[PDB]
Amino acid sequence: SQAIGILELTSIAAGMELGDAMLKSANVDLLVSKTISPGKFLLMLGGDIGAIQQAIETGTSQAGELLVDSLVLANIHPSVLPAISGLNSVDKRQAVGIVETWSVAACISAADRAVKGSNVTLVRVHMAFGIGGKCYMVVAGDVSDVALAVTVASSSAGAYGLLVYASLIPRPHEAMWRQMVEG
Amino acid sequence: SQAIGILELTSIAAGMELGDAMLKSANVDLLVSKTISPGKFLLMLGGDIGAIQQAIETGTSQAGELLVDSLVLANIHPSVLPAISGLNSVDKRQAVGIVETWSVAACISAADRAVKGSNVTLVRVHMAFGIGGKCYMVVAGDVSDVALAVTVASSSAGAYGLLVYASLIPRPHEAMWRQMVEG
Amino acid sequence: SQAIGILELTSIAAGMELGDAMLKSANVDLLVSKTISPGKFLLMLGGDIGAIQQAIETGTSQAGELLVDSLVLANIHPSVLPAISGLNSVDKRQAVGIVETWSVAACISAADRAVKGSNVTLVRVHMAFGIGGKCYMVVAGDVSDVALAVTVASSSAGAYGLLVYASLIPRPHEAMWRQMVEGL
Amino acid sequence: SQAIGILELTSIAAGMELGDAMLKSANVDLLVSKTISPGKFLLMLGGDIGAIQQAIETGTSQAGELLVDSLVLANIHPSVLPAISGLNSVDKRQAVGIVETWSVAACISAADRAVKGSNVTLVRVHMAFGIGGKCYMVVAGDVSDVALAVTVASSSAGAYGLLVYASLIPRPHEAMWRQMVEG
Amino acid sequence: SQAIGILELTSIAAGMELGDAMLKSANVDLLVSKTISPGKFLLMLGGDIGAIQQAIETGTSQAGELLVDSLVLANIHPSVLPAISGLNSVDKRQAVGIVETWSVAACISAADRAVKGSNVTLVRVHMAFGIGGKCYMVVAGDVSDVALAVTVASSSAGAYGLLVYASLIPRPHEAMWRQMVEG
Amino acid sequence: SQAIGILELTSIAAGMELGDAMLKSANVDLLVSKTISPGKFLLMLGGDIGAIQQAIETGTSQAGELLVDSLVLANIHPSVLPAISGLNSVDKRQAVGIVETWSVAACISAADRAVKGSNVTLVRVHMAFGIGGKCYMVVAGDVSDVALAVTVASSSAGAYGLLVYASLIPRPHEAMWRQMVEG
Ligand SMILES: [Cl-]
């Protein structure tokens, strides 16, 4: 189905050039394009597996020694992609679930499992710092659906030893709602 | 309300003497009285907080250097006590939740949180070995109640860094049901 | 022919969930499903190679970092499966052979070679502790068949440096027979 | 009088073979025949001193480097033998004495002095782990006889620096009686 | 009821001055007042808890940095006090029990438990050296009472890992009786 | 019965002089008399236990500091002696068993157990190098007798932790038969 491509470089100039070349190489969407401390550059792409494998191969080969890391995550639910690049909005104040992991890969995989295994809205996937640091996914919906999504996502991250913590908030206080659902 | 008292000793002779002396107090139930590999003795008591505080106080004193550890868990839901000493029967084949922790204390606290915070049956609390080793609680009910119980118990254990793993089995196979719900 | 699947996990909760999933994934029989000290969980399956490979693949992928070890032992004699889950009953009191190894894998392979290479009854395959610990297989039959089974099993285990000891008891005493053939 | 023979081996296969050979060598009774962690095997025999010395000599010589340890305990009271292999029944619910030691040898010697030095029933001798590990003996009778047995057994074990603890329970509770007198 | 007060000082001159002040502060009896190697001074008092707590408080405050240690042992059977300062006379030649411990506190507590838990005469409590060294208590009476006293005292000391040895001598020889019962 | 004596010398001259006294003793058979690298001399003797113990005493006193090692193996089956000095003939192809050990002592003891415990022909006992190095015994007969001999010899060597490997060849290839049965 859909796939995520991650490419991390030692150079910002190379990161911008390679990001540009990957977008032209296939039908891929740019999800993340940013500098990470201490001067590394991160790119995240979303699209069909074939296009993602092609874009990541183009990027990795042209990167040479500037390549920090590259990764392809296959069979990702389509709603995961706008949750990485931004938000999937929620109307009313409903139950919120937060699953915090180490690494964006564990976070994406757990979020994928949550959307496939429940009827929640995956609101956002957030990287606090880089690809190896603290990440969290936010889900919203009916309290029962959220509890199911939180359980399924926790099992996914826990199997890899990458679960930090998970919480369920049946009806967040108005002062917390915007921070949880928007950031 | 109800309380759990835990007394662990390196002496089987002291364990049996102290277990007997604890039962001299009215309204205390000896939930567990067992030998722990390689030659430790474990006593778990249930009853009113006052009786348990008294029983454990005396037990800790009189054990002296043979005392491995002692603990009092106050405000425990009454259904947790038969789940420690045996089983609360499941009279319908429904969804099962298992939460595994390090230490019996984290397991009892998470089991207590699950019964207070959802509409599940707490089937059993199992200590694989001693009070510091692997423990797990088993819950049963509708998938949505079980998802809520597993989430609430996981948050309780995770706050102490003592969560191992948690699983939800919506429709357990014939061959696994007996082992999960009875042991 | 028949195959043995072994899955060892760091988590009891994962072990029970994965045991359930493996049973639903294919036509496999649960031979062993138990906690091993200091809190590991062990699953052993029996069935056709295809079903075993499928169940073990399902289990290993879903296990992630909870996986301690996994193994598929192909072309196993059918009588080895009930000897792992329990006992194969002994027809009449005769000679007994015991082959002790390090690891259940060396023990299963040795037991399989013994049954294929002689006319003995494979009574049981016993794990004293976990999958990497002391294991032993018990065979029964005529002295000559048992000698042949013990020799063949010892060579199998010895080739891997995993043989502890092997013994042949031609006429077991009343008091030892029950322990050797049942376990007690 | 009667004697106890102990043989500990590094191999289960050798243990079963040597156990069998010792039973054929003389008129000895098999008291214990079991695996001990981490894969050692333990044999305990009872009978006449001559038969025991013969069986243990046969076993030790054939054991070679598989021998962990061997021991012969001479002049043992006959009631000690069924207390090692199982239980001696208690004719009435009465006072109980428990003497816990390091090593089965110190425990057998203390049990033997207790039976010879007082009018108690030696209920059982329990070896929690192996031969060098924690062991305990259980005696039953009237308070005075039990006090005498516990004192005599404690002095025996204490002289060798092998006494863990000793207790006297004049009136054991129903819930403890079964565990003390049966296990 | 009755209580024992222990005050240990680094100075003999301060010991004698504080001993004098404690005797004037309350209705207390001087049980022990002696130099201990390598030049420490020991004071032991007997009396009512209130008077003992008052005398020990007076002593501890005035001792300053000269204080080695101080202790108050409450609920002491009255017969323990003359057994510390001297001897309780023995009516006739019967059985003798000796319980040897590390520390005078373990010895006093074991002696107190023995008199309360049996019909023996507590003959004497002896400190071979100082408050932390080898101590022993001597009891006398019928064999059965002595066995009970020795078991109860041994359990008290053994629970704290302070039991050296305990012995029962049913019919002491003429030549040993005087040494055991008088010193 | 029969026995083997093993004498190892630092000197070839001393070894040959001692071999001469053994050749002159009518009750002692000089089985092997040869140099071992790096210039040690080896004598192997056969005879009854009395004759051997004496030959070893004669050798140990006459050699003094030139003796590297000496060993007496008692209760050796007579067929082992020609298997040490040469071969026990076997012509027609039969099943073959090989038991390999560390040390000639473990090999002789294993070979002796094989001949006593089965109807095989012990063909030869071979030392690849010296007395502490790799050795092997070769047996021939019916497959069932060979299986029994190999099992019994393996248990003998294994008990001493000196078993390398054992093999059974039911139907040897003629090109391998000559090497196994003759060397
Ligand atoms: Cl609101």
Short mmCIF file of C-alpha atoms in Angstrom, two decimals, chain F residues 5-182:
data_model
loop_
_atom_site.label_atom_id
_atom_site.label_comp_id
_atom_site.label_asym_id
_atom_site.label_seq_id
_atom_site.Cartn_x
_atom_site.Cartn_y
_atom_site.Cartn_z
CA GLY F 5 52.10 -50.84 34.38
CA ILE F 6 53.08 -47.59 32.65
CA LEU F 7 56.55 -46.18 33.22
CA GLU F 8 57.68 -42.93 31.55
CA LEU F 9 61.37 -41.87 31.62
CA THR F 10 63.22 -38.63 30.85
CA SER F 11 66.20 -40.75 29.62
CA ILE F 12 66.30 -43.27 26.69
CA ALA F 13 69.47 -44.95 28.18
CA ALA F 14 67.70 -45.38 31.59
CA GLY F 15 64.52 -46.58 29.81
CA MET F 16 66.37 -49.31 27.87
CA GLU F 17 68.28 -50.43 31.01
CA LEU F 18 64.94 -50.67 32.89
CA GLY F 19 63.36 -52.50 29.90
CA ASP F 20 66.19 -55.06 30.17
CA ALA F 21 65.35 -55.85 33.86
CA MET F 22 61.62 -56.18 32.74
CA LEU F 23 62.54 -58.56 29.86
CA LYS F 24 64.57 -60.63 32.42
CA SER F 25 61.54 -60.79 34.87
CA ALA F 26 59.59 -63.93 33.87
CA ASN F 27 56.35 -62.61 35.59
CA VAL F 28 56.39 -59.28 33.66
CA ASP F 29 55.67 -58.87 29.95
CA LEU F 30 57.27 -55.87 28.25
CA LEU F 31 54.34 -54.79 26.01
CA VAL F 32 55.75 -51.54 24.65
CA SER F 33 59.34 -50.21 24.88
CA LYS F 34 59.81 -47.05 22.83
CA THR F 35 60.87 -43.39 22.67
CA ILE F 36 58.17 -40.63 22.79
CA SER F 37 58.82 -37.01 21.65
CA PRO F 38 60.68 -34.84 22.80
CA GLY F 39 63.02 -37.61 24.01
CA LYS F 40 61.09 -39.42 26.77
CA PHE F 41 61.09 -43.19 26.92
CA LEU F 42 57.99 -45.26 27.56
CA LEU F 43 57.60 -48.74 28.98
CA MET F 44 54.34 -50.57 29.19
CA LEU F 45 54.06 -53.72 31.24
CA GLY F 46 51.63 -56.60 31.63
CA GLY F 47 51.36 -59.14 34.46
CA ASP F 48 49.45 -59.97 37.59
CA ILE F 49 48.90 -57.10 40.09
CA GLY F 50 51.66 -58.29 42.47
CA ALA F 51 54.21 -58.60 39.58
CA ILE F 52 53.23 -55.09 38.33
CA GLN F 53 53.30 -53.22 41.73
CA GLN F 54 56.79 -54.73 42.21
CA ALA F 55 58.02 -53.90 38.69
CA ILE F 56 56.80 -50.26 39.34
CA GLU F 57 58.65 -50.18 42.72
CA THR F 58 61.85 -51.61 41.06
CA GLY F 59 61.49 -49.02 38.23
CA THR F 60 60.69 -46.03 40.50
CA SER F 61 63.70 -46.71 42.82
CA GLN F 62 66.17 -47.70 39.98
CA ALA F 63 65.08 -44.58 37.90
CA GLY F 64 64.81 -42.01 40.71
CA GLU F 65 64.46 -38.50 39.22
CA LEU F 66 64.45 -39.96 35.67
CA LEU F 67 60.88 -41.18 36.18
CA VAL F 68 58.36 -38.72 34.56
CA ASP F 69 55.28 -40.78 35.56
CA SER F 70 54.20 -44.25 36.65
CA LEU F 71 50.78 -45.86 36.73
CA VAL F 72 49.26 -49.18 37.70
CA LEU F 73 45.90 -50.25 36.22
CA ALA F 74 44.57 -53.28 38.10
CA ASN F 75 41.85 -55.86 37.06
CA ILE F 76 42.51 -55.72 33.34
CA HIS F 77 41.00 -58.43 31.10
CA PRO F 78 43.82 -60.57 29.56
CA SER F 79 42.83 -59.75 25.92
CA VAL F 80 43.73 -56.06 26.51
CA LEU F 81 47.50 -56.92 26.86
CA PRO F 82 48.05 -58.19 23.21
CA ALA F 83 45.85 -55.24 21.99
CA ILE F 84 48.38 -52.85 23.64
CA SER F 85 51.54 -54.61 22.33
CA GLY F 86 50.12 -55.25 18.85
CA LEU F 87 46.89 -56.58 17.40
CA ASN F 88 44.37 -59.27 18.13
CA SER F 89 43.85 -60.56 14.55
CA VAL F 90 40.63 -60.11 12.64
CA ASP F 91 40.44 -60.78 8.88
CA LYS F 92 36.87 -60.98 7.44
CA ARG F 93 34.97 -57.71 7.39
CA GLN F 94 32.59 -57.28 10.38
CA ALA F 95 31.03 -54.27 12.14
CA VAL F 96 33.69 -51.94 13.69
CA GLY F 97 33.57 -49.67 16.73
CA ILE F 98 36.07 -46.93 17.58
CA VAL F 99 36.28 -45.17 20.96
CA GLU F 100 38.64 -42.21 21.18
CA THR F 101 39.87 -40.80 24.50
CA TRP F 102 42.40 -38.39 26.03
CA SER F 103 45.10 -40.54 27.79
CA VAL F 104 46.07 -44.22 27.38
CA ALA F 105 44.75 -44.94 30.90
CA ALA F 106 41.16 -43.91 30.02
CA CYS F 107 41.50 -45.91 26.77
CA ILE F 108 42.74 -49.10 28.54
CA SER F 109 40.00 -48.80 31.18
CA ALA F 110 37.35 -48.26 28.49
CA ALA F 111 38.73 -51.23 26.38
CA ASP F 112 38.66 -53.46 29.50
CA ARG F 113 35.00 -52.57 30.16
CA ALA F 114 34.11 -53.28 26.46
CA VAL F 115 35.67 -56.81 26.49
CA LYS F 116 34.08 -57.70 29.87
CA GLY F 117 30.69 -56.31 28.86
CA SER F 118 30.37 -57.79 25.31
CA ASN F 119 31.55 -60.62 22.97
CA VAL F 120 33.61 -58.36 20.65
CA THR F 121 37.20 -58.82 19.56
CA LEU F 122 39.29 -55.93 20.99
CA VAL F 123 41.48 -55.44 17.89
CA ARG F 124 43.92 -52.79 19.17
CA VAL F 125 44.54 -49.97 21.63
CA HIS F 126 46.46 -47.21 19.87
CA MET F 127 48.41 -44.22 21.31
CA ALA F 128 48.55 -41.49 18.59
CA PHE F 129 51.39 -39.75 20.59
CA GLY F 130 52.24 -40.15 24.31
CA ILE F 131 50.38 -41.36 27.44
CA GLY F 132 48.41 -38.11 27.88
CA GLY F 133 47.49 -37.60 24.21
CA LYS F 134 44.72 -38.92 21.92
CA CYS F 135 44.21 -42.69 22.11
CA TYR F 136 41.70 -45.00 20.56
CA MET F 137 40.52 -48.57 20.84
CA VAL F 138 39.12 -50.58 17.93
CA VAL F 139 36.55 -53.37 18.41
CA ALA F 140 35.05 -55.78 15.82
CA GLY F 141 32.17 -58.26 15.84
CA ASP F 142 28.38 -58.40 15.18
CA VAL F 143 26.75 -54.94 15.00
CA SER F 144 24.81 -55.61 18.28
CA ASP F 145 27.95 -56.68 20.20
CA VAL F 146 29.90 -53.70 18.81
CA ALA F 147 27.02 -51.30 19.79
CA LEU F 148 27.14 -52.73 23.30
CA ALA F 149 31.01 -52.51 23.48
CA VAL F 150 30.99 -48.87 22.20
CA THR F 151 28.28 -47.85 24.70
CA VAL F 152 30.05 -49.48 27.69
CA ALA F 153 33.51 -48.05 26.66
CA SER F 154 32.00 -44.54 26.08
CA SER F 155 30.42 -44.55 29.56
CA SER F 156 33.76 -45.64 31.10
CA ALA F 157 35.71 -42.75 29.38
CA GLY F 158 32.87 -40.22 29.78
CA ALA F 159 32.74 -40.77 33.57
CA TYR F 160 36.29 -39.40 33.71
CA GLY F 161 35.58 -36.52 31.28
CA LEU F 162 38.07 -38.14 28.88
CA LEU F 163 35.80 -39.25 26.01
CA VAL F 164 36.56 -37.53 22.69
CA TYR F 165 34.18 -39.39 20.37
CA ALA F 166 32.92 -42.87 19.59
CA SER F 167 31.74 -44.28 16.29
CA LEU F 168 30.05 -47.44 15.05
CA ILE F 169 30.55 -48.54 11.40
CA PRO F 170 28.18 -51.50 10.74
CA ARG F 171 29.42 -52.27 7.21
CA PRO F 172 32.92 -50.83 6.68
CA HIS F 173 34.20 -50.09 3.15
CA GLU F 174 37.25 -52.31 2.40
CA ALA F 175 39.52 -49.22 1.85
CA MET F 176 38.79 -48.09 5.48
CA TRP F 177 38.68 -51.64 7.13
CA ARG F 178 42.49 -52.16 6.81
CA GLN F 179 43.28 -48.79 8.44
CA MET F 180 40.77 -49.36 11.27
CA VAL F 181 41.79 -52.99 12.03
CA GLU F 182 45.56 -52.82 11.38
#
